[PDB]
Amino acid sequence: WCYEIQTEDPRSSCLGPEKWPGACKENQQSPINIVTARTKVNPRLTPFILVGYDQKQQWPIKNNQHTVEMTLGGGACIIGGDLPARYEAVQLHLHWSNGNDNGSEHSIDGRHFAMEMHIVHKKLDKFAVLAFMIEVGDKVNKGFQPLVEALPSISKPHSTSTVRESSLQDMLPPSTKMYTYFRYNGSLTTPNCDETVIWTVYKQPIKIHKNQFLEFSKNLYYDEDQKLNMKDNVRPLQPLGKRQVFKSHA
Amino acid sequence: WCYEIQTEDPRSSCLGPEKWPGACKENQQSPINIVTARTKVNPRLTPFILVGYDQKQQWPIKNNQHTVEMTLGGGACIIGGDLPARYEAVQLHLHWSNGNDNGSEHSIDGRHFAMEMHIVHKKLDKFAVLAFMIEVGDKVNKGFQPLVEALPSISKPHSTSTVRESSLQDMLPPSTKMYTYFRYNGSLTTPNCDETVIWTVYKQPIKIHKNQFLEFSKNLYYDEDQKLNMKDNVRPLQPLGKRQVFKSHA
Numbered sequence: 268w269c270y271e272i273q274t275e276d277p278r279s280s281c282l283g284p285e286k287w288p289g290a291c292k293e294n295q296q297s298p299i300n301i302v303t304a305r306t307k308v309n310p311r312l313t314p315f316i317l318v319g320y321d322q323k324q325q326w327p328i329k330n331n332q333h334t335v336e337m338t339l340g341g342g343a344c345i346i347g348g349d350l351p352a353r354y355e356a357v358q359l360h361l362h363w364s365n366g367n368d369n370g371s372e373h374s375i376d377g378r379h380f381a382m383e384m385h386i387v388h389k390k391l392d393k394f395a396v397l398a399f400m401i402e403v404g405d406k407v408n409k410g411f412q413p414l415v416e417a418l419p420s421i422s423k424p425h426s427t428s429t430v431r432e433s434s435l436q437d438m439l440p441p442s443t444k445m446y447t448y449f450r451y452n453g454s455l456t457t458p459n460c461d462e463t464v465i466w467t468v469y470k471q472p473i474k475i476h477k478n479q480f481l482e483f484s485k486n487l488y489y490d491e492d493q494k495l496n497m498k499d500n501v502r503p504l505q506p507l508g509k510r511q512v513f514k515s516h517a
Numbered sequence: 518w519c520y521e522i523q524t525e526d527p528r529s530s531c532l533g534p535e536k537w538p539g540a541c542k543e544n545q546q547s548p549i550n551i552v553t554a555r556t557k558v559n560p561r562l563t564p565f566i567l568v569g570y571d572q573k574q575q576w577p578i579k580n581n582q583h584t585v586e587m588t589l590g591g592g593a594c595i596i597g598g599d600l601p602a603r604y605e606a607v608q609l610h611l612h613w614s615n616g617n618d619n620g621s622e623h624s625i626d627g628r629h630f631a632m633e634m635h636i637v638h639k640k641l642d643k644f645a646v647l648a649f650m651i652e653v654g655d656k657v658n659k660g661f662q663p664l665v666e667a668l669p670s671i672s673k674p675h676s677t678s679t680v681r682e683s684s685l686q687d688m689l690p691p692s693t694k695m696y697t698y699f700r701y702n703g704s705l706t707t708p709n710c711d712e713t714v715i716w717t718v719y720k721q722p723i724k725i726h727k728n729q730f731l732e733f734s735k736n737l738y739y740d741e742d743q744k745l746n747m748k749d750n751v752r753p754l755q756p757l758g759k760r761q762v763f764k765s766h767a
């Protein structure tokens with residue numbers, strides 16, 4: 268299976284979003300477009316208790332042929348946010364493009380951002396995915412620097428590597444900016460699209476420099492022969508269906 | 518009013534703990550001695566959501582004649598921990614002595630520590646005071662360094678000063694070590710001893726170097742003439758009464 272951009276090569280052809288295996292065609296798919304003016308408030312949506320996010324250590328990364336995967340291996344844990352149980356951090360990856368206005372899978376009021384980050388948590392419901400919007404800024408983001416530096420070494424798919432001493436916490440916006448977010452039931456945005464995901468999309472975006480952003484498409488490749496750089500690894504908007512989207516603030 | 522150590526001077530005499538004004542003689546006073554084997558578990562005692570603890574800024578400090586006060590001025594906020602409402606950080610101070618085994622007001626199983634830190638929060642119940650035990654170690658604590666350096670400048674009572682760029686978070690133990698704590702209703706440990714305090718005492722202590730610890734008694738003074746260094750600003754154990762002490766873990 269692959270994204271639209273990958274089917275463009277006349278030579279060889281795979282299952283683009285249009286033909287992704289069963290379950291991707293179901294009643295409750297992600298991503299969606301959040302219409303703020305139509306979201307219901309739920310007081311219980313109190314900020315997450317972030318455990319293990321302040322720990323500094325080396326992170327094993329790899330190009331999985333679809334994105335840059337960073338293994339968190341249960342080092343972190345999250346509690347609260349009206350979640351049924353406790354979830355642990357498993358992996359972290361991103362979705363991007365070549366512009367600063369159409370690289371995020373989700374969108375808030377018809378607005379797509381530069382990139383979108385996904386921190387996946389397995390139930391210790393089933394998956395609790397925290398999604399952050401990223402926006403290109405005129406200033407460098409020290410928190411993201413460690414991740415950018417390891418990019419040149421994992422160019423081709425399946426390459427393993429490691430990220431220098433860093434902590435998840437420094438990659439997110441301040442704790443005082445994590446009050447406002449959106450909740451809704453959905454699915455994985457890639458096959459097989461298991462509808463066992465509880466989504467939390469935050470309003471405040473993370474700003475990274477234009478040069479840090481360009482490093483992704485420049486160093487990462489989808490193929491072994493390094494003919495197609497990695498970008499546009501984004502799935503198109505899915506119909507809201509009958510689902511209801513909530514927000515933490517009133 | 519003053520502590521025992523201050524009444525020792527034959528010249529002049531004030532109200533030692535023995536004669537502290539009304540309310541200090543009531544049915545539910547703090548500190549107490551936590552008997553772990555007799556504490557009741559309460560699942561609701563889930564870890565606090567620490568807001569504004571990750572912010573780095575200059576902190577105004579002053580010797581208030583009873584301890585080293587550090588104004589947090591509502592910069593931080595705490596939510597959860599089965600608290601009735603949200604509380605904001607107002608001030609931070611400490612209680613110590615000259616040894617490493619009898620400077621903490623509270624005690625866990627007949628054991629007193631080197632120092633005890635108190636981060637006071639006003640109700641945005643009434644006061645939510647987080648108490649941390651401090652222990653002398655063989656390694657320096659970078660998180661506490663900023664506070665130690667400002668000590669020499671606030672020797673005499675009522676001296677104002679400022680602490681260099683630092684954050685509350687780096688002064689506490691890791692987030693993964695803040696799972697176990699104790700809850701109980703009590704009062705201020707100094708006059709007038711208002712019984713409007715919800716206490717949270719954490720099990721894991723903060724370790725600081727023996728030299729960092731000695732700086733407190735060496736630089737701080739109770740009096741204008743700097744004849745009596747500051748130490749033993751600790752109130753003696755108060756009877757548990759009929760109160761019940763809970764713990765977050767089972």
Ligand SMILES: CCN[C@H]1CN(CCCOC)S(=O)(=O)c2sc(S(N)(=O)=O)cc21
Pocket residue numbers: 333334358360385387394396454455456457458
């Ligand atoms: C990118 C790799 N494709 C899947 C892989 N995994 C699904 C296997 C079930 O668990 C064994 S995953 O749980 O790590 C996960 S989360 C997302 S998303 N984009 O955050 O909606 C996609 C995916």
Ligand SMILES: CCN[C@H]1CN(CCCOC)S(=O)(=O)c2sc(S(N)(=O)=O)cc21
Pocket residue numbers: 583584608610635637644646704705706707708
């Ligand atoms: C040390 C100064 N003595 C009081 C001052 N204040 C009580 C005035 C009521 O509010 C206006 S206080 O709330 O900042 C507070 S908390 C404690 S303790 N040791 O943490 O139990 C003592 C005190």
Ligand SMILES: [Zn+2]
Pocket residue numbers: 360361362385456
């Ligand atoms: Zn994703």
Ligand SMILES: [Zn+2]
Pocket residue numbers: 610611612635706
């Ligand atoms: Zn105190």
